[PDB]
Amino acid sequence: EVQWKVVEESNYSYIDPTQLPYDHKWEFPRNRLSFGKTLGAGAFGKVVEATAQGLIKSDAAMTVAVKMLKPSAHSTEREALMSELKVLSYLGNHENIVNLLGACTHGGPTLVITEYCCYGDLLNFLRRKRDEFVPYKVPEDLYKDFLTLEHLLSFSYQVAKGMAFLASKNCIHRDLAARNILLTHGNITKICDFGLARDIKNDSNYVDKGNARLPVKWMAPESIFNSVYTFESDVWSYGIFLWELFSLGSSPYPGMPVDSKFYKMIKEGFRMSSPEYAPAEMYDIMKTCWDADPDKRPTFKQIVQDIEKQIS
Numbered sequence: 001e002v003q004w005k006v007v008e009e010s011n012y013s014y015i016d017p018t019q020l021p022y023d024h025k026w027e028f029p030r031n032r033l034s035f036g037k038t039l040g041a042g043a044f045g046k047v048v049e050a051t052a053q054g055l056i057k058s059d060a061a062m063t064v065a066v067k068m069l070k071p072s073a074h075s076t077e078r079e080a081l082m083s084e085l086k087v088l089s090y091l092g093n094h095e096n097i098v099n100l101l102g103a104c105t106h107g108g109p110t111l112v113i114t115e116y117c118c119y120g121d122l123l124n125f126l127r128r129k130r131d132e133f134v135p136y137k138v139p140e141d142l143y144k145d146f147l148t149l150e151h152l153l154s155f156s157y158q159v160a161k162g163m164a165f166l167a168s169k170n171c172i173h174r175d176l177a178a179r180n181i182l183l184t185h186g187n188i189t190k191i192c193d194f195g196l197a198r199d200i201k202n203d204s205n206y207v208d209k210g211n212a213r214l215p216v217k218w219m220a221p222e223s224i225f226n227s228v229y230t231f232e233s234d235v236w237s238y239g240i241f242l243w244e245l246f247s248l249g250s251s252p253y254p255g256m257p258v259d260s261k262f263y264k265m266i267k268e269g270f271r272m273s274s275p276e277y278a279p280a281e282m283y284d285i286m287k288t289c290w291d292a293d294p295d296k297r298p299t300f301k302q303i304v305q306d307i308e309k310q311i312s
């Protein structure tokens with residue numbers, strides 16, 4: 001919205017990602033990329049499955065995901081893709097994020113080489129295993145490839161470790177949701193920012209507010225109503241993700257259209273109830289994540305230590 005704002009005294013401010021350095025150690029020869037099918041495409045950017053010759057081991061090739069722009073992209077999009085590469089180069093490597101493997105910044109359009117996660121996004125994975133879920137396995141043949149409570153607990157734990165990594169790098173996600181979590185071999189979940197590769201206009205999970213489209217049902221109140229995005233507001237989005245996880249990919253606040261009454265109810269203390277398969281101690285974490293006071297929400301470092309005792 002382009003309007004007036006009354007302000008009150010309360011810090012952190014975004015950095016201009018174009019000012020971040022790009023380390024050319026990530027430069028990978030473009031001629032060693034063999035492109036496959038497009039995995040997903042936004043309005044201006046797309047992620048393509050590809051084969052990278054000698055990227056990690058000089059002997060053999062490996063499947064990777066290459067993030068690139070469409071022909072319709074303008075100079076601002078090309079700057080944005082370069083800034084996304086500069087952020088990934090800045091953050092460093094962690095197991096629970098979609099990591100940067102290389103980049104092609106020469107001899108053509110910019111190609112960002114990321115890890116390929118064979119299972120896709122966690123949201124579609126959960127909704128696919130809905131009829132194949134049991135809390136724990138009793139004859140094991142009947143639950144061959146079943147999803148269990150052990151898996152969901154590991155997912156909550158890995159996403160929390162990934163977010164804890166981002167917070168330690170002074171990085172705010174601002175769009176934490178199951179659709180932005182990817183699953184790869186060994187049930188490893190990886191956080192990522194789709195950025196230019198998700199078409200926000202065609203996704204009902206992003207609500208048209210003014211001129212912007214925001215993931216309202218995942219956002220903390222101070223984000224929706226005060227435009228305040230912090231480490232603590234990410235924790236709110238993690239609580240909404242937990243509700244997705246233990247409802248097996250159900251849309252949050254199911255059956256509630258986003259309108260003025262919805263915003264009012266959230267401000268007055270309205271919260272979702274416990275998912276059907278959520279353990280009690282995990283739902284406790286949800287309620288703390290959804291505290292209207294950002295000071296009373298747990299940090300991701302605390303969430304990691306909390307879930308760790310549950311795993312053990």
Ligand SMILES: COC(=O)c1ccc2c(c1)NC(=O)/C2=C(\Nc1ccc(N(C)C(=O)CN2CCN(C)CC2)cc1)c1ccccc1
Nearest residue numbers: 039040047065098114115116117118119120121192193194
């Ligand atoms: C910063 O990094 C990023 O921003 C980023 C963004 C997306 C991906 C990524 C990095 N890394 C991946 O791997 C991504 C996806 N990968 C994938 C894998 C498997 C599938 N599935 C299940 C298929 O069936 C498709 N596919 C399987 C393999 N055969 C050969 C071809 C058909 C679908 C998507 C994917 C992309 C679009 C939307 C959701 C996820």
